[PDB]
C-alpha cells in the first residue's frame, strides 16, 4: 500500500495566490494569472527537488533532510537561512 497522489497543483487555491500577490504589493490582478503561477511554481519545484533528491541518494538516503534542500537552494544562488 503506497500513496500515489494526483493533480494537487490546484491545491494552491484562488485566495492562496491572491494573498501571496497581496504580500507583493499588488491590488489588481487578472483571473488569467493563477494557472500560470501554479505552473510557474511547479517548474521551480521540479528544478529544486531534482538535485535535492540526487543529493539524498548520493548519501544512500531515502529520507530527505533539510540540509539536502538548503544545499540545493544554495546551488542556484537562492541562499536560505535559519535551518543549517
Amino acid at each position: 500500500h503506497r500513496k500515489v497522489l494526483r493533480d494537487n497543483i490546484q491545491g494552491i487555491t484562488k485566495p492562496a495566490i491572491r494573498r501571496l500577490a497581496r504580500r507583493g504589493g499588488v491590488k489588481r490582478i487578472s483571473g488569467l494569472i493563477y494557472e500560470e503561477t501554479r505552473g510557474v511554481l511547479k517548474v521551480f519545484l521540479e528544478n529544486v527537488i531534482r538535485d535535492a533528491v540526487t543529493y539524498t541518494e548520493h548519501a544512500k538516503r531515502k529520507t530527505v533532510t533539510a540540509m539536502d534542500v538548503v544545499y540545493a537552494l544554495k546551488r542556484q544562488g537562492r541562499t536560505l537561512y535559519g535551518f543549517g
Partner: protein, 95 residues
C-alpha cells in the same frame, strides 16, 4: 544524544552583551546568525584560496586575507573591518 552541534552560539550571544547588555534573542534568529557567519566564513575562505593558487603560493596568510576581505566587502565595511584586523593582529604580535 552522543553528538555535538558545535555551533557559534555562545560566541555571538556573548557578543550581544558589550553592545546591548539588555537585549534578548530568538532561537530562530540565533540559528540565522550561525548560518550567516559560517557563510561569510567559507566565502572568504574560497576567495583567499583561489587567490593564492593564482599567486602559486602554498600558504594562506593575513595579507592575502586582507585583500580578499577588501574584495568582498563593499564600502566603508572594507575600511573599518581591515582597521580592526590590523589592530588585532598588532596587539597579538605584542605577546
Amino acid at each position: 544524544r552522543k553528538s555535538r552541534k558545535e555551533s557559534y552560539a555562545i560566541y555571538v550571544y556573548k557578543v550581544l552583551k558589550q553592545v546591548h547588555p539588555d537585549t534578548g534573542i530568538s532561537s530562530k534568529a540565533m540559528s540565522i546568525m550561525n548560518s550567516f557567519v559560517n557563510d561569510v566564513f567559507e566565502r572568504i575562505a574560497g576567495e583567499a584560496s583561489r587567490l593564492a593558487h593564482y599567486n602559486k603560493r602554498s600558504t594562506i596568510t593575513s595579507r592575502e586575507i586582507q585583500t580578499a576581505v577588501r574584495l568582498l566587502l563593499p564600502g566603508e565595511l572594507a575600511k573599518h573591518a581591515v582597521s580592526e584586523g590590523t589592530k588585532a593582529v598588532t596587539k597579538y604580535t605584542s605577546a
